[PDB]
Design a protein around this nucleic acid. Sequence first.
RNA 1: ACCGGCCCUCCGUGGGCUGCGCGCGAGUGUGCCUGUUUGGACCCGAAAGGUGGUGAACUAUGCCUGAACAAGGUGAAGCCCGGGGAAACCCCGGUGGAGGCCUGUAGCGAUGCUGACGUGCAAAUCGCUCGUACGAUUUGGGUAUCGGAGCGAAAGACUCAUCGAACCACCUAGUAGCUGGUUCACGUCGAAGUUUCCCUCAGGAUAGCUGGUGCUUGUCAAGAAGUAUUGUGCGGU
RNA 2: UGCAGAUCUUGGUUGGCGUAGCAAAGAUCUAACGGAAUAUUUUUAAAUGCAACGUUGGAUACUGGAGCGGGGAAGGAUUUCGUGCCAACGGCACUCGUACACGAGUUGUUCGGUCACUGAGCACAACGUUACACCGUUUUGUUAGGAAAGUGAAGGUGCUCUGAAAAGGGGCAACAGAGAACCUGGGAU
RNA 3: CCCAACUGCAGACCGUACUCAUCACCGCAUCAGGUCCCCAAGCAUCGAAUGCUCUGGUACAUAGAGAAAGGUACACUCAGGGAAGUCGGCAAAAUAGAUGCGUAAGUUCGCAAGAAGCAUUGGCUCUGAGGGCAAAAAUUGCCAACUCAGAACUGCUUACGGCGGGGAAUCCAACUGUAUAAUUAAAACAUAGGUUUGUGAUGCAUCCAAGUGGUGUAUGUCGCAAACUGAUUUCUGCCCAGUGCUCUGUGUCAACGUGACGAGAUUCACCGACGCGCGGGUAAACGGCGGGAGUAACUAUGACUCUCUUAAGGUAGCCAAAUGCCUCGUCUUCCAAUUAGAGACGCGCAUGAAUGGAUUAAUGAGAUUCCCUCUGUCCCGAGUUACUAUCUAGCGAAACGACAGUCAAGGGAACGGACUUGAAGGGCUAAGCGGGGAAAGAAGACCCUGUUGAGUUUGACUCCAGUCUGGCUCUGUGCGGCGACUUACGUUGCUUCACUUAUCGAAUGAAGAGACCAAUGGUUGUUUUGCGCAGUCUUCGGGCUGUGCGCCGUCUAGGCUGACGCGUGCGGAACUACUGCGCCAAACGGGGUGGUUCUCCGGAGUCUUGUUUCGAGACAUCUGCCAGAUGGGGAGUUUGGCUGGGGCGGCAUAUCUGUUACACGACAACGCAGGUGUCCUAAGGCGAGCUCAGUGGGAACAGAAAUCUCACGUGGAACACAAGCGUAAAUGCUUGCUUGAUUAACGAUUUCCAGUACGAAUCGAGACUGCGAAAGCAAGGCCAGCGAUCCUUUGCGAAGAACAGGAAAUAUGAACAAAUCAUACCAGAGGUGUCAGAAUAAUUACCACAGGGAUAACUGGCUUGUGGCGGCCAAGCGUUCAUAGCGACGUCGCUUUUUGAUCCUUCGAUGUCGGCUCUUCCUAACCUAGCGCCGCAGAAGACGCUAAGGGUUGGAUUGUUCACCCACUGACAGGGAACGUGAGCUGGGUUUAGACCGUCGUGAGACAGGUUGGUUUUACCCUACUUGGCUGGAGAUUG
RNA 4: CUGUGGAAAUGCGAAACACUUGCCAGGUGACCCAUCCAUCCUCCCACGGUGAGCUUUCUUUUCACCAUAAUCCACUUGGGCCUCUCGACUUCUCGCGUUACUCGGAGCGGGGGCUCAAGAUUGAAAAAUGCAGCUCACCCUACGUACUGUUGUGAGUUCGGCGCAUUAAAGCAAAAACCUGGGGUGUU
RNA 5: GCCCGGAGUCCGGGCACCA
Length: 254
Amino acid sequence: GKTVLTCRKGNGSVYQVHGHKRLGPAKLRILDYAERHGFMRGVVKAIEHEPGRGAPLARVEFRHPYKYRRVKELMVAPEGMFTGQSMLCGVKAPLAIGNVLPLGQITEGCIVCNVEAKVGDRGTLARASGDYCIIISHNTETGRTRLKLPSGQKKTVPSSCRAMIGIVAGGGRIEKPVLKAGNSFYRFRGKRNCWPKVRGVARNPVEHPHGGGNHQHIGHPSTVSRHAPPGQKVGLIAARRTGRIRGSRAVRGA
RNA sequence: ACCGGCCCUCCGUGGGCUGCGCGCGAGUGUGCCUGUUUGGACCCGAAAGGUGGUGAACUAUGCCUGAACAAGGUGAAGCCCGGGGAAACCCCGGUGGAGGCCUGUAGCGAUGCUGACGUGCAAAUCGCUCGUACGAUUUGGGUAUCGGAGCGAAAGACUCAUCGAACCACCUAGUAGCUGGUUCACGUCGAAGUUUCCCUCAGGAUAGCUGGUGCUUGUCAAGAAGUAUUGUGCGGU
RNA sequence: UGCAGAUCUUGGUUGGCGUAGCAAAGAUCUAACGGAAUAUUUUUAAAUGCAACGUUGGAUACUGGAGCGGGGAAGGAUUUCGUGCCAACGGCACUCGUACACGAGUUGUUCGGUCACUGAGCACAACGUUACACCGUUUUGUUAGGAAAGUGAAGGUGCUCUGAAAAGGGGCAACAGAGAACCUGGGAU
RNA sequence: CCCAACUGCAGACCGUACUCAUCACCGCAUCAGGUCCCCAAGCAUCGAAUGCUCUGGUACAUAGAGAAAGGUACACUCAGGGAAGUCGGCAAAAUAGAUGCGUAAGUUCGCAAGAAGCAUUGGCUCUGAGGGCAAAAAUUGCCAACUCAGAACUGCUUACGGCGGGGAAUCCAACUGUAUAAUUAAAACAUAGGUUUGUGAUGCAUCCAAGUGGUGUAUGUCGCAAACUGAUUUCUGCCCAGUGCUCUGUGUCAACGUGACGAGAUUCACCGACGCGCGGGUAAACGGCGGGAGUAACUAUGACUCUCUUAAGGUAGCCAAAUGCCUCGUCUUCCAAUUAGAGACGCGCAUGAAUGGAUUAAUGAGAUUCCCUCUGUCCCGAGUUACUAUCUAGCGAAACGACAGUCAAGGGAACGGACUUGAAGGGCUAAGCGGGGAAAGAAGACCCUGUUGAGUUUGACUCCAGUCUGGCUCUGUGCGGCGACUUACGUUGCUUCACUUAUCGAAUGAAGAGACCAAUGGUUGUUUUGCGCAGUCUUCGGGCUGUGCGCCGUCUAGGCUGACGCGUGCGGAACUACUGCGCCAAACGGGGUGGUUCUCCGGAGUCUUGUUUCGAGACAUCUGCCAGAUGGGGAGUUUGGCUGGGGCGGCAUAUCUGUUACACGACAACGCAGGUGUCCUAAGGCGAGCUCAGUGGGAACAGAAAUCUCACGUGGAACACAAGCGUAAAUGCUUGCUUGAUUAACGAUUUCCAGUACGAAUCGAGACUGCGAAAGCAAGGCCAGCGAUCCUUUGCGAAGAACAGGAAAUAUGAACAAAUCAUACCAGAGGUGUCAGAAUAAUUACCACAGGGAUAACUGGCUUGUGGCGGCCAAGCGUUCAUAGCGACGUCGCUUUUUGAUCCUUCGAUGUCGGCUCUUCCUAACCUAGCGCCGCAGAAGACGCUAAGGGUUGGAUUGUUCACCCACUGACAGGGAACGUGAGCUGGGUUUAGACCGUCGUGAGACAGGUUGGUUUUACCCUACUUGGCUGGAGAUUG
RNA sequence: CUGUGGAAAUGCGAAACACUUGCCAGGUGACCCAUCCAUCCUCCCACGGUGAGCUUUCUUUUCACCAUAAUCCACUUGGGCCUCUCGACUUCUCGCGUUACUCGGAGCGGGGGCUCAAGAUUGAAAAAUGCAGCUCACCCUACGUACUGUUGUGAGUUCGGCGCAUUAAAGCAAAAACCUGGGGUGUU
RNA sequence: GCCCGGAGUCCGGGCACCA
Ligand SMILES: [K+]
Ligand SMILES: [K+]
Ligand SMILES: [K+]
Ligand SMILES: [K+]
Ligand SMILES: [K+]
Ligand SMILES: [K+]
Ligand SMILES: [K+]
Ligand SMILES: [K+]
Ligand SMILES: [K+]
Ligand SMILES: [K+]
Ligand SMILES: [K+]
Ligand SMILES: [K+]
Ligand SMILES: [Mg+2]
Ligand SMILES: [Mg+2]
Ligand SMILES: [Mg+2]
Ligand SMILES: [Mg+2]
Ligand SMILES: [Mg+2]
Ligand SMILES: [Mg+2]
Ligand SMILES: [Mg+2]
Ligand SMILES: [Mg+2]
Ligand SMILES: [Mg+2]
Ligand SMILES: [Mg+2]
Ligand SMILES: [Mg+2]
Ligand SMILES: [Mg+2]
Ligand SMILES: [Mg+2]
Ligand SMILES: [Mg+2]
Ligand SMILES: [Mg+2]
Ligand SMILES: [Mg+2]
Ligand SMILES: [Mg+2]
Ligand SMILES: [Mg+2]
Ligand SMILES: [Mg+2]
Ligand SMILES: [Mg+2]
Ligand SMILES: [Mg+2]
Ligand SMILES: [Mg+2]
Ligand SMILES: [Mg+2]
Ligand SMILES: [Mg+2]
Ligand SMILES: [Mg+2]
Ligand SMILES: [Mg+2]
Ligand SMILES: [Mg+2]
Ligand SMILES: [Mg+2]
Ligand SMILES: [Mg+2]
Ligand SMILES: [Mg+2]
Ligand SMILES: [Mg+2]
Ligand SMILES: [Mg+2]
Ligand SMILES: [Mg+2]
Ligand SMILES: [Mg+2]
Ligand SMILES: [Mg+2]
Ligand SMILES: [Mg+2]
Ligand SMILES: [Mg+2]
Ligand SMILES: [Mg+2]
Ligand SMILES: [Mg+2]
Ligand SMILES: [Mg+2]
Ligand SMILES: [Mg+2]
Ligand SMILES: [Mg+2]
Ligand SMILES: [Mg+2]
Ligand SMILES: [Mg+2]
Ligand SMILES: [Mg+2]
Ligand SMILES: [Mg+2]
Ligand SMILES: [Mg+2]
Ligand SMILES: [Mg+2]
Ligand SMILES: [Mg+2]
Ligand SMILES: [Mg+2]
Ligand SMILES: [Mg+2]
Ligand SMILES: [Mg+2]
Ligand SMILES: [Mg+2]
Ligand SMILES: [Mg+2]
Ligand SMILES: [Mg+2]
Ligand SMILES: [Mg+2]
Ligand SMILES: [Mg+2]
Ligand SMILES: [Mg+2]
Ligand SMILES: [Mg+2]
Ligand SMILES: [Mg+2]
Ligand SMILES: [Mg+2]
Ligand SMILES: [Mg+2]
Ligand SMILES: [Mg+2]
Ligand SMILES: [Mg+2]
Ligand SMILES: [Mg+2]
Ligand SMILES: [Mg+2]
Ligand SMILES: [Mg+2]
Ligand SMILES: [Mg+2]
Ligand SMILES: [Mg+2]
Ligand code: NA
Ligand code: NA
Ligand code: NA
Ligand code: NA
Ligand code: NA
Ligand code: NA
Ligand code: NA
Ligand code: NA
Ligand code: NA
Ligand code: NA
Ligand code: NA
Ligand code: NA
Ligand code: NA
Ligand code: NA
Ligand code: NA
Ligand code: NA
Ligand code: NA
């Protein structure tokens, strides 16, 4: 046979991200001495749109801690951010929408976004259009905090990780029907080469495990093992169950 | 009878087997022809397999930076002015110019005549007719992804007239129980398509039929005869 | 070391045969001149030198500005110009020619490129891997466990010492992007 | 030294001609193909449509003459009828601009829509409406542009170009789009909408020979990766038994470990993970979703009942549907007539629910039926034009070419140009034509064979990457817990917890770590910080253990309490406010030392048993090496034979009996009738006694059949089994005793046969025996019942005796000895049934090669069962009467228009159904001519004779031949000619590649099932035929 | 005096309104459709002067031409802003404006000003050029010399108005080079 | 063939195959 399309994407030749018009990575500011002992004040200068992303971004301007110069950062904007607003980051920052605080300084039951999973990672959780986390409890003996992720899972992180108060802007994006193949064409223009999609049963036996036959059909169960080699692992991978879901859903993941 | 080897018995000047043994040597070197075997192997011929390199100017898809798209039809939202009504709200006339909207040039395609040509203008072209024509649109240059690999709105399509595995050189004069060929004269002889075994049934080995070289002899006849006679046996058509 | 055949190899010759044809894009006519291509006869004029070629004037007609108009890129590289010339070539013809021969022609402070920008991208150095570099990384601000700055602010001396500040090696990739100081007339071919 | 206005001098390098295309580029070429950019006039007109023209550019494409046939056309017209043509309205005709009026069902309310349909349109002369700019303003004056609406008069030959035909229905796909360059544009793909799965980064998917390597990821669940269905509306039923996927506590599974016997190799015991088994879940995972009886007041049907059975027994819906074999189903409608269309019905070979069911407005170069208009598609053809062909001037090929070119019959390799017999035939030739040359092209692609392949699949055989799992190593420090070992003290195997230096993850331009707040810290230190107590050692110098006291060692914003003590705190000087945009750098000062110059110290806290900082941490998410499972993701190879083709079937593949078999022996077929892969310690061996099957006469229950008795009884019984042969004081039956079913020095021979092996059998010699009084019989059950090389495995070569290897002691392990281990020689056993003995699953319609007429699918040839057409005899039918007309039970033929049987010709090719067109032949006579006969009154008919000269139709449905209806007629006969006729046509069907459905298969795929779409090439040669001309010749050229 | 004028929008240029690659911050480069108005230019008309065409009859007629490069100097239309009006919708429903989807106490409109963009006019260049006519005029062989002439309210047309500027789950590259300012140096 | 388990021993499992 020939190589399956799932394996060909791993080479990454014509299937890499389109990033010519992107503005760069969106991160919180570097954790330094000032943020660990006091607070730094910044000003929101502009709200900008980046192709391939749903949530808007904010340009915040700070003063350099040690030099006579200005530092410009690029972050994911929470809902309610406006131009001219003052942003405070540090252990002594107050509790308000748009501030960045250590997780141990936020009262249980608050809504946060842009949460670090490692101290100094500069934000890796709850970054999509309308997502947020919820603080559940603090453990002062071990200095750890418990969070509820947008997927419904619970995670424990060190209390020195930072987070932003509020929810990400741009929510409710997936509620509008697309109605046209042309609209999907423009949506994927800024992400990567992955659309349109051809079904496996419509291909030939040389290309896909589902191809071939005088009728269009899979001839074997479509649930495939976790240990299957690449080129054989297509269909529903290591599925614990199949079919229409009746009742309360279970929590996805491991 | 003797030499070597394996044995049996009543244990003898018994017995019975076995050797590519002995039994007054015949070998060895060289020339030449014929036969068997390996090699390119009497001459020409596959579909395949492997090692290393060259191609995205045809064509497939992504990216960067440029260019292009007559003339009409229909008439969405928003806005204006009038009426009706207790209200809620409803109605007419304008304006405006939306749409993977319609007719239709250029452009991009290729439905029918199963038209023309069919040793052509052409190793796919020509004529009418036909699809679409502000969009998932057409197009220049640059750049990125390939050979058990690349790319594909998927037809096993396309990757320089080559693709159900490209091209170039080499291993390679690849192997072929199968098809084709195989160059002077006269003379003496002259067949078989049957038996047994073989993954054997388009092929071999084996016996038979044939040729050559003879050996030992005889000469009217040995171990002669596809025939009779006499005698003596066999038989169930 | 002897050939009649292997859809055998390489040359030459051959009937078919002066045959099949040389039928898309409408079309030419006339006088004069040129040319060896005539108005060519011994044995009145027609019935015995046909047919065809270039230039100029006139006539007729086509292309019909999405042109058999005027300029460029890719590609080609003397096909450009003058004079001469008709053996072979332009599947008919040639006195014509993008044919053949002999000589000529391309001029920039300002036009295009470059000096001198970045893009999709490439891959020297450094490091790592490989039996073997002919392998990998090398723009998400950016090489390398990584000492890659050779520049020089204020100040002193005299008419040339001491040192503040600057993180992230060296290149290439656009003749349609960025950039770029000149216009008309000519009797000047 | 800086500058303004001038001025003086100098301004480097490469490109520059021409072209950019119906002749300069790529297509072998000056090729009707292809190739990016800029400039773009006048009139008609909505106009870059189309037609004509000024500027600029061309007259370059081989020409002249000129009404043959047949052709091509970006050329036309036809009376009357109007699809009767055809598979099919293919092709052509036809509608058409603008303005006014008007417009159906259905519908997602947007559309459908230009729905459908009616009317007007020329020319000329007039009239009205629609505006700007000025002024001392419902006024006056001046002036531009081309639309719209009317009136009178007058005319038509309906008159350029350009420009939708329309309607009623069924099937499929929602729509725009894509897509097999060069035979398929579609119902296929995509799409929006819907559902499911994995996954919180040390992740999921995944590239890669390898590394601190790479992609989705410049990302973070409203995300990324992997599948299925295919808009909206209304819905999506039951099954977890099978296969798969997935989640939890003890049988089995490997290395590594831990112990034993032994001198050691060897061997044994215990321990030992994932996985597989057990136990759950899961169908919008692959898939699946029944039989048989009876039963209601006429019959029918069966609401009802019973029965067998499943994991569940097809629910809502829909149907002779692109799915129904029978089948042209049955009823209605459409027509004069319908294998067609529509609407109904449903025990549906084999419909059915995201392998999606049902329905749908709009859309479609998609499939099908009907209607209006229109027509040369047809009845049935005719006339005209331009370019060819035709003749001439110039120029000038190819294909093909054994040799050649008149027929009839015959035989022949079964369809001759050549051969046999007959019949024609003077020579040369121009234009046509498609009967023959089984004409040309291409070593048949269909079918079969080869110990040839390739693409694809999986439950084939043998393996490899990837994933998971165990062991060791990487690997360090303490305090404990639970066991083990050996005579409570020492090691060790697992572990709880606390550490940090190995290692791992992340961030940062390695940008402020920890302490100073003080110990179950260290105190051998940069330039001289140690001092005691107790115990115990000593090289007599001083150590070690445990303890104390000094030293290392130290500052600070704020806030409480009594400058200065104590506690707290832990490195701190921040506009408010409810939410909204200001500037900050290259040091001021102050001390010490130098002469208000130059330097040090603060401003700006000190220190470092040292790690850049966080997180984890001796684990794995790390490195390497062994071990196990999984693993069509990938590699390699295989997938019997015979055969009235091959396949399915069968075994004629190794073997036994009777017959074919022709009176020695031998003899074929997928010939006939039957057997074999076993069974028996007795069913083997011997001695003795006896006589079987059956029949007849007799005896309580007792009978046709129980047991007893007498007689006859040539085997009619028995002998394991198939059959044949054989046997009577026995080869049979009963009984007694036994192990000849052992060993048997390589003795010889028969059968098959090569005079090989294997199996079976025959005649002997030697040992020890059995039964017999003995002679004698017996080393299986008479003849069928079985197996090479290599490899594995068992038995025999006991103990002693021999001054030496001998008649009589098995041999070797090569320098030699002791004990193990291994090997050799002889006789058996574990098996090859394809049986003289390879280790082996499918598919190809995407297909390939070498060959085969040794072999199938057409024609032809032999045959004629079957099909068709006839005779002879005469039981009966015919009011009686065998024979007007028929004729059973039987029997004799003919034909090659059916289909079978065979395999002779053709596989380096003879174009494979039907229709259209055209000619000819046959007679078994439908009509037409003339007759005989009747159950012939007339009329209409039945049967038969001579006779093939003439004739033999128009339509609906279907690809059809065939079939069946409507209508006309004198009649609507049957057949042949390579199942006449494709270089004559057509291409509907059949039979490639695309795609859908049903059934089958795990799958790739299959179906003589249904459906839609799918290049038809060449004549100029010879002959034949049709016309057209030139010209010799009687010794048919001469005598 | 130590740049300077104006209450303000912001103006003033012979050389001190000098320097600023120590440093920092902005901007230009730099990107967006369609409608409407519309540049350079083209085509039509009107006005008429040079030469040709036709003229049996008509035609104050038909045709050709009628031009101004770069560079430099000195009233309109549109946008933004300042000032005054002791500042408008006080009051049953205010006002300005576009073909068009709207704007105003966070300051409409009106008078007067400042500034930007696109044009108009005037002049230097520039008539000395170019194009036609005459060329039996005045010459002779010279490319020879004199001389004459030199309106649009139309219809098209992307330069510009024009962007924080299009459908948008689509939101329209970057850098060199250059410009200005904040601080600082400098003149008295 | 090995390990088992359940009945001198027949079945059910998990493994292993040079005549
Ligand atoms: K040889
Ligand atoms: K190539
Ligand atoms: K429109
Ligand atoms: K309709
Ligand atoms: K369209
Ligand atoms: K299509
Ligand atoms: K199509
Ligand atoms: K289509
Ligand atoms: K001629
Ligand atoms: K000629
Ligand atoms: K000629
Ligand atoms: K012929
Ligand atoms: Mg990238
Ligand atoms: Mg900062
Ligand atoms: Mg397909
Ligand atoms: Mg596969
Ligand atoms: Mg298929
Ligand atoms: Mg070869
Ligand atoms: Mg091979
Ligand atoms: Mg290309
Ligand atoms: Mg259209
Ligand atoms: Mg054709
Ligand atoms: Mg296919
Ligand atoms: Mg050879
Ligand atoms: Mg031969
Ligand atoms: Mg002879
Ligand atoms: Mg064999
Ligand atoms: Mg020769
Ligand atoms: Mg000719
Ligand atoms: Mg021709
Ligand atoms: Mg013309
Ligand atoms: Mg020529
Ligand atoms: Mg030349
Ligand atoms: Mg780059
Ligand atoms: Mg440029
Ligand atoms: Mg330049
Ligand atoms: Mg051409
Ligand atoms: Mg007009
Ligand atoms: Mg045109
Ligand atoms: Mg036009
Ligand atoms: Mg020509
Ligand atoms: Mg007619
Ligand atoms: Mg008529
Ligand atoms: Mg018909
Ligand atoms: Mg048609
Ligand atoms: Mg209606
Ligand atoms: Mg109409
Ligand atoms: Mg469609
Ligand atoms: Mg379409
Ligand atoms: Mg095609
Ligand atoms: Mg749906
Ligand atoms: Mg649907
Ligand atoms: Mg199940
Ligand atoms: Mg049905
Ligand atoms: Mg049907
Ligand atoms: Mg019909
Ligand atoms: Mg079914
Ligand atoms: Mg279901
Ligand atoms: Mg189905
Ligand atoms: Mg459409
Ligand atoms: Mg279509
Ligand atoms: Mg004949
Ligand atoms: Mg012949
Ligand atoms: Mg062949
Ligand atoms: Mg064979
Ligand atoms: Mg395989
Ligand atoms: Mg005999
Ligand atoms: Mg015999
Ligand atoms: Mg006896
Ligand atoms: Mg015997
Ligand atoms: Mg197919
Ligand atoms: Mg044959
Ligand atoms: Mg042949
Ligand atoms: Mg042929
Ligand atoms: Mg033929
Ligand atoms: Mg026949
Ligand atoms: Mg035929
Ligand atoms: Mg044909
Ligand atoms: Mg035919
Ligand atoms: Mg024919
Ligand atoms: Mg078909
Ligand atoms: Na799809
Ligand atoms: Na399907
Ligand atoms: Na399916
Ligand atoms: Na459209
Ligand atoms: Na042969
Ligand atoms: Na042109
Ligand atoms: Na460059
Ligand atoms: Na050109
Ligand atoms: Na030409
Ligand atoms: Na589809
Ligand atoms: Na299951
Ligand atoms: Na049903
Ligand atoms: Na029907
Ligand atoms: Na750091
Ligand atoms: Na066979
Ligand atoms: Na017969
Ligand atoms: Na007759």
